[PDB]
Amino acid sequence: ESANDKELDQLLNEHFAGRVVRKDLTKLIKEGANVPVYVLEYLLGMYCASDDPEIIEQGLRNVKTVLAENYVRPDEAEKVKSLVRERGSYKVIDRVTVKLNERKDKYEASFSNLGIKDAEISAGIVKEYEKLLVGGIWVIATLSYYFEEGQTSSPFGVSLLKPIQMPNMNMDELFSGRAALSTDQWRESLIRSIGMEPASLKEDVQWHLLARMVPFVENNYNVCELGPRGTGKSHIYKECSPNSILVSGGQTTVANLFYNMSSRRIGLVGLWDVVAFDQVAGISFKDKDGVQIMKDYMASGSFARGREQMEASASMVFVGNINQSVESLVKTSHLLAPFPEAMIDSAFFDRFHAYIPGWEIPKMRPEFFTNRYGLIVDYLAEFFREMRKRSFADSIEKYFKLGNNLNQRDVIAVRKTVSGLMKLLYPHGQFNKEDVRQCLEYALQVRRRVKEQLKKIGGMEFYDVHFSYIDNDTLEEHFVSVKEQGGGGLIPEGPAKPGFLYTIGLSNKGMPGLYRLELQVTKGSGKLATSGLWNSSSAKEQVKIAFDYFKANASRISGGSKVMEHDFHLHVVELQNTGPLSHLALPSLVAFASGLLGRSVQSQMVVLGDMSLGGSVTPVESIAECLQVAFDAGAKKVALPMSSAADIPTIPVELFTKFQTSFYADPVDAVFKGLG
Amino acid sequence: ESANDKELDQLLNEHFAGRVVRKDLTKLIKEGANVPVYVLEYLLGMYCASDDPEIIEQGLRNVKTVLAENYVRPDEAEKVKSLVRERGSYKVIDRVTVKLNERKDKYEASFSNLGIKDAEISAGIVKEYEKLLVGGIWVIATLSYYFEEGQTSSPFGVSLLKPIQMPNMNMDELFSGRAALSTDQWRESLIRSIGMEPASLKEDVQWHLLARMVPFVENNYNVCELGPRGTGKSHIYKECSPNSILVSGGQTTVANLFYNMSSRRIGLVGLWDVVAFDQVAGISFKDKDGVQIMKDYMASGSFARGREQMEASASMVFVGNINQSVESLVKTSHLLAPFPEAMIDSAFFDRFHAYIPGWEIPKMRPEFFTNRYGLIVDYLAEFFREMRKRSFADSIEKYFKLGNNLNQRDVIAVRKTVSGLMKLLYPHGQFNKEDVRQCLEYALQVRRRVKEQLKKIGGMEFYDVHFSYIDNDTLEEHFVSVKEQGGIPEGPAKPGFLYTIGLSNKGMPGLYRLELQVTKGSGKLATSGLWNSSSAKEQVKIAFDYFKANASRISGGSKVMEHDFHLHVVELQNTGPLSHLALPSLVAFASGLLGRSVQSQMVVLGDMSLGGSVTPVESIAECLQVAFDAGAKKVALPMSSAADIPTIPVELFTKFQTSFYADPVDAVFKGLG
């Protein structure tokens, strides 16, 4: 693949000019070089001619010589001014920002290090390099000193000005270059440009790394990434981007972050494209409302502060370190456990457009640091800033429709993540159905993870976690799962928690399907709540009939427990995707009884049959297929109605031998058999 | 339906030509745009000619191109200035305000995003668009630069300027359009005008949506709304109105909200028509007098700061999230437990002109968003702003009088809410009696909810919660219930609770709850909730007199003359006033005085005269059916009513433990067990 790497290299060089550099060489210079990384990369690229080892060493020495010659320390600032005054001219490497003084009608340059804030600069220079007027750029400048008695202008002037970072972007050339590369090659280049080696990483790791780069290209893209220490979470936001900030500690005051009423200056969010809170273990505010103002901002993208409502395009990223195992946190808690208590709220975490699963990222080891060609970090960041202005959210509706389990906020999050990934991988705008399918699958997964955490932390509101999408041509519905949860494993071995049971029923399509009934019992007034029923009216009537029978027969079952003093929520989970179920009165009643008494349903036990309001039990239709499903789903015990008894001979012998079979008579007997 | 939808579309296109648009296409632009929505509305109004899909798509392309080309990023702001200088002139999109520099006698425009504060603009441009002088409007401007050495004025000048908001308001045309439409059509169009699907919502949700709009038309009209997340409470105040501001977090200093003495400038309450405090759970003012100033402003519409009293017409809205169930919150502190403890004060909540039950509204779902024609958001906001100037609270005196339960604050609140609804639905001023009937019922109900909550906080001082209105023609007094909250429990309650069933004034069987509170006193009797009925008060007096007469037979030594009794009637089915209340009142007095809880799930039937003669239960079968519906397990009946037992259905009768007394004292004995 090294030869393929060389064809990649020449595909770069054909279209990507010196804006491609060898990454390893930067690791040779960044030993304390005071200029930022992208400055070093640009200089090395513009002093790297033909990659001859002698030429590499020569250019490396030239870059080091220039840096050691023309740099000025802050405290030495006064010194350099004298050198300008004595010599009449002096070269300096510094970050210059240009402003227009309309009062004097001229261009005034300001240096970060030297502290000069009124250096006269000609209009031609600023016309050539417009970035000076935007945020200021690193530059090599030839300052000249000329003073006239009684003058008002600062005597310092700028004569020759050569940028040290890429000033202007030819986006069309990049479109042509990307068109010249395959998708795999382009993804490899993107992974390389941040200093990572695609050959040392699985494709899933590559997609997660691209998800890390999503916030740089999508507006108001809130995202949180939690992982084990040392997985390279905070590298990109702090070193490999000039328009992102890594707020260390998370402790920033409201007037700092959003808007200072006294000084009437916008906070961070109006200045940086990405604001990354480096830690989450300790975020606790001086002002109680900081969480609330973040909630509003991430909700709408605009906040009212003082006398005005102001917009902002900063994407907030939250980086977190986990000391526990993933399974421990999932089983004993919710994955948002490391976040501070004052931040643990459904209304807050609902706004996150993505939960990056950082733990699948391997802990970084010098193998993953690539030594091949890659785009300059400056060029990559200019790519990101340019792509923030465009949009690709409409690509989803062209080939797919979002399922019924996505409320409006999940829709927004999925569209944003898909648009971001499309911008990274297909900037030129040419894409197929498969590509959108892959991006949509990834987006649905990452949003679903937040949805599951919201479910566990918030209860009633977030049980619609069955994220799926509908094809526009075959109308086939594809479901997407998260690996920290299950998938298959239809009925696990061992005792289930009370209130959870499994049933098999005939769906709307007539094919037997497994369902799981989950009952949540809390203190209340006997109110019954429903979820997961596919909005089926007949199913809701069945639930009402079952709960009415439970209310009428509470004494005959519980022997003293009061249903009137506890509220129940029944959730239906479909594990085979056959369709909505109507025959559910008996399993729902068994779930009610199990939850009220707190008795675990027998392990691997399937409850069949249906019951009416009068307490009559009904035969199980297509009982042989239902029992075959139970065998397939992992059942070992079955409760069958005595009415289905005449249907026993139709069942194959080897199939029927697999059940510790129970035959109930009336719904209360079925409850007792289920409870053992 | 669909035919009605289409004909409404041509009606909107006819009477509101150039002011309506398919609002679905707007969400096709919103995502990739920082500009406020109403500006997009106006631009699409300008760049869209008809319903040709090609025309629509090409106009969308044109609008996107315009916005991409001529928007000014704040960070990019300085760049634009240089571009003006080098090219002589440059076109920008920005929000412009104008002030008259009287020292130079010239008009200076301020570009809020660009950073220019004193750009010279000619008097003609000022005179063409007076909206520039009020709060500044979003315009497309042609900046020009012209500098001569030694000059003192700002070298930036504006040559061409076109507004991107509705510049002028023609409410004569609006009245024409409203008169040309039915009330249902007008309400449905208003609901469409905020982007919601009218057909997908119930009438009650539509009325609550209109109650959301009310603060935009009535001065100083406070309102509080708590509800589940995702109902779009904050959408209207934050995006669909240039005359509203959503203060985030509730944390605001009195200097910014009301008046800054250092700058001698009025706060938000003088600048915006609607100030909405989001997520009220975080409200807390640094200065303790802040709550005092809020109370003063909300009570009087003006506040005194230092030595000066200053007026303001801002309408305050308080939106909040509910994290519990609806019913669970009812048994919490009241309903506004979500409100901060520093704001939990009876005098504070007494000012809220309205509670909006945000919980009943279904959570926002994409099929609730309309795709049909609706008024431009800017047009609707200007409509609201102009309608703020009128008054319609006098409409009730034309047809109805208020009840006697309403104090002056409740009277003011109900008049304000009636006026707001009346302005929203009938700006043209032509209306009938039934329309005012509906609006007045809504206003009374929403005020009554606040009254119930404030009663739950304060105890006795706010007891008159039985708000009602009297017709001027039939003199029939109609009572309004909280319905939602006003939906037999379980187990014996404390003495003084009982549930009775009787035929209301309409002749319909209904359930009522009797409440007795007994304190140390002198045999005095107090009554409440009796619908102000002279007859019902008469039977209560009859029952109290009979209880006083036969106190020895029932109490066995307890003295009626040493204790004061207060009775309360609560109608839980809204069937109407009940007159047959003597026997339940007697059982109430007996339970309260003896301190004995009545038997659980028992409903007492029948009535008695002053002499103790028991009357047969009218509509015995229907009353028993009502008892079964409400959850009654035991029933007490007169002996003479047993003759009507053969008229009772078997299945209905088998559900109760039926008790037959003989005289009222035996009824007491059966009730108390």
Only one residue has tokens 């994220």, namely: A467
Shortest CA gap A35–chain B (Å): 23
- Integer CA distances (angstroms), B259 to B85, B268, B293, in order: 40, 8, 11
CB A313 within 8 Å of CB A353: no
User: Quick one: DSSP state of residue A339?
Assistant: S
Query: Using CA atoms, how far apart are residues A182 and B498, in angstroms rounded to an integer?
Result: 80
Q: Would you call B422 helix, strand, or coil by DSSP?
A: helix
Strands A566-574 and A468-471: unpaired
Distance in angstroms (rounded) separating the CA atoms of residues A85 and A63: 27
Q: In a 10 Å sphere around its CB, with 0-12 CB exposed, 13-18 middle and 19+ buried, how is residue B242 labelled?
A: buried
Strands of B125-173 (E only): list them: 137-145, 156-163
Q: What CA dihedral angle connects A331, A337, A343 and A344, to 10 degrees?
A: 20
Question: Cα separations (Å) of A225 from A334, A355, A409, A432, B176?
Answer: 14, 6, 19, 29, 58
What pairing do the DSSP bridges indicate for beta strands B223-227 and B315-321? Answer: parallel
Helix, strand, or coil (residue B171): helix
List the alpha helices (DSSP H) in A214-289: 235-238, 254-257
Structure tokens at A292: 């609330």
Residue A308 to residue B363: CA distance in whole angstroms: 29
Backbone φ and ψ for B469, nearest 5 degrees, come out as -130, 145
Backbone angles phi, psi at B426, to 5 degrees: -130, 70
Q: Alpha carbon B382 to chain centroid distance?
A: 21
Q: What angle do CA A208, A210, A215 make, to 5 degrees?
A: 110
Chain A (600-639) residues lying within 8 Å, Cβ to Cβ, of chain B: none
Instruction: Catalogue the E-assigned strands of A366-494.
Output: 373-375, 400-402, 468-471, 477-479
Segment holding B470, helix H or strand E = strand B468-471
Give the span between the Cα atoms of A127 and B83, in whole angstroms. Answer: 9
* ∠ Cα B94 B95 B96 (to 5°): 110
CA distances from A300 to A173, A222, A450, B97, B232 (A): 35, 12, 19, 25, 11
Sign of CA dihedral B188, B194, B199, B203: negative
A411 vs B: CB within 8 A = yes
Q: For residues A464 and A462, what is the distance between their CA atoms, to the nearest angstrom?
A: 5
Is residue B508 within 8 A of residue B575, CB to CB? The reply is: yes
State which H helix or E strand residue A455 sits in.
helix A433-458
Where are any strands of DSSP class E within B241-366?
Answer: 244-247, 259-260, 265-266, 274-277, 302-305, 308-311, 315-321, 355-357
Question: Coil, strand or helix: which one is A145?
Answer: strand
User: Percent helix, strand and coil across chain B, each rounded to 5?
Assistant: 40, 20, 35
Q: Is A171 on the interface with B (CB under 8 A)?
A: no
Q: Which residue numbers come right before each break in chain B (C to N over 2.5 Å)? A: 487
Count CB atoms within 10 A of the CB of residue A651.
18
Distances (CA, A) of A16 to A40, A430, A446: 18, 20, 33
Helices A203-213/A183-193 angle, 10° precision:
60
Apex A515 CA angle, A512 and A518, nearest 5: 165
Which among A309, A460, A464, A567 is the top mutation candidate for probing chain B, defined by the most B β-carbons within 10 Å of its own β-carbon?
A: A309
Distance CA(A219)–CA(B520), nearest Å, equals 69
- Residue A432 sits at the vertex; the CA angle it makes with A431 and A438, to the nearest 5 degrees, is 95
CB contact under 8 A, B31 and A409: no
- Residues in chain B with CB shorter than 8 Å from the CB of A300 are 234, 238-239
* Contacting B residues, span 539-598, partner chain A, CB-CB under 8 Å: none
Q: Alpha-carbon distance A466 to B385, whole Å?
A: 45
Distance in angstroms (rounded) separating the CA atoms of residues A441 and A425:
15
Q: Do B282 and A288 touch (CB under 8 A)?
A: yes
Q: How many CB atoms neighbour CB B493 within 10 A?
A: 16
To test the contact with chain B by mutation, choose from A110, A266, A292 the residue with the greatest count of B C-beta atoms within 10 A, namely: A292
Cβ pair B75:A135 closer than 8 A: yes
Per the CB < 8 A criterion, the answer to whether B357 and B229 are in contact is no
Out of A100, A289, A415, the one facing B78 most closely (by C-beta) is: A100
Domain A500-675 grouped into CATH 3.40.50.300: no
Instruction: Give the resolution value in Å.
Output: 3.6
Is B86 part of the contact surface with chain A (CB cutoff 8 Å)? Answer: yes
Q: Which two tokens stand for residue B516?
A: 């007795």
In single-letter form, the type of residue at position A228 comes to: P
Q: Is A102 on the interface with B (CB under 8 A)?
A: yes
Radius of gyration of chain A (CA): 32
Return the HEC string of B207-225: HHHHHHHHHHCCCCCCEEE
A391 at B interface, C-beta within 8 A: yes
- Judged by DSSP in three states, B565 sits in strand
**Counting runs of H as helices and runs of E as strands, what totals does chain A give?**
24, 28
Asked if A315 and A217 count as a contact pair (C-beta separation under 8 A), the reply is no
| CA proximity to B216, closest of B462, B384, B461 | B384
Rounded Cα gap, residues A349 and A370, in angstroms: 36
The answer to whether the Cα torsion of A255, A261, A265, A270 is positive or negative is positive
Q: Residue A407: its chain B contacts at CB < 8 A?
A: 230, 363, 365
**Taking the mean position of all CA atoms in its chain, how far away is CA A668?**
48
Technique used by the depositors: cryo-EM
Reported in sequence order, the residue ranges of A566-609 that DSSP labels E, i.e. its strands, are 566-574, 605-607
- Contact between A182 and A7 (Cβ < 8 Å): no
Q: How many residues does chain A have?
A: 676
Contact A595, A556 (CB under 8 A): no
What is the Cα–Cα distance from B578 to B569, expressed in whole angstroms? 9
Q: Which of B366, B8, B361, B3 is nearest to B197 (CA)?
A: B366
Instruction: For residue B578, give the DSSP letter.
Output: B
Q: Give the residue on A whose Cα is nearest the Cα of B269.
A: A307
Residues contacting A575, CB < 8 A, separation 6+: A490, A513, A514, A515, A516, A633
User: Pairing mode, if any, of strands B497-503 and B509-520?
Assistant: antiparallel
Contacts of B323 in chain A (CB under 8 A): 346
Query: Distance (Å, rounded) from C-alpha B636 to C-alpha B609?
Result: 17
Exposed, middle or buried: residue B515 (CB in 10 Å: 0-12, 13-18, 19+)?
Answer: middle
Pairing of the two strands A274-277 and A315-321: parallel
Cβ–Cβ contacts within 10 Å for residue A643, how many? 15
C-beta separation of B541 from B528 below 8 A: no
Report how far residue B295's alpha carbon sits from residue B226's, in angstroms, rounded to the nearest whole number: 20
Contact assessment for residue A350 and residue A454, using Cβ atoms and an 8 Å cutoff: yes
Contact A409/B at CB under 8 A: yes
Distance CA B74, CA A271 (A): 9
Q: Give residue A374's identity as a one-letter amino acid code.
A: G
Amino acid (one-letter) located at A661: T
Q: Is CATH 3.40.50.720 the classification given to domain B497-672?
A: no
Nearest-by-Cβ selection for A100 from B82, B238, B245: B82
Q: Which two tokens stand for residue A303?
A: 């906040």
Q: Which of A531, A601, A529, A521 is nearest to A561 (CA)?
A: A521
What is the Cα–Cα distance from B513 to B493, expressed in whole angstroms? 12
CA B449 to chain centre: 10
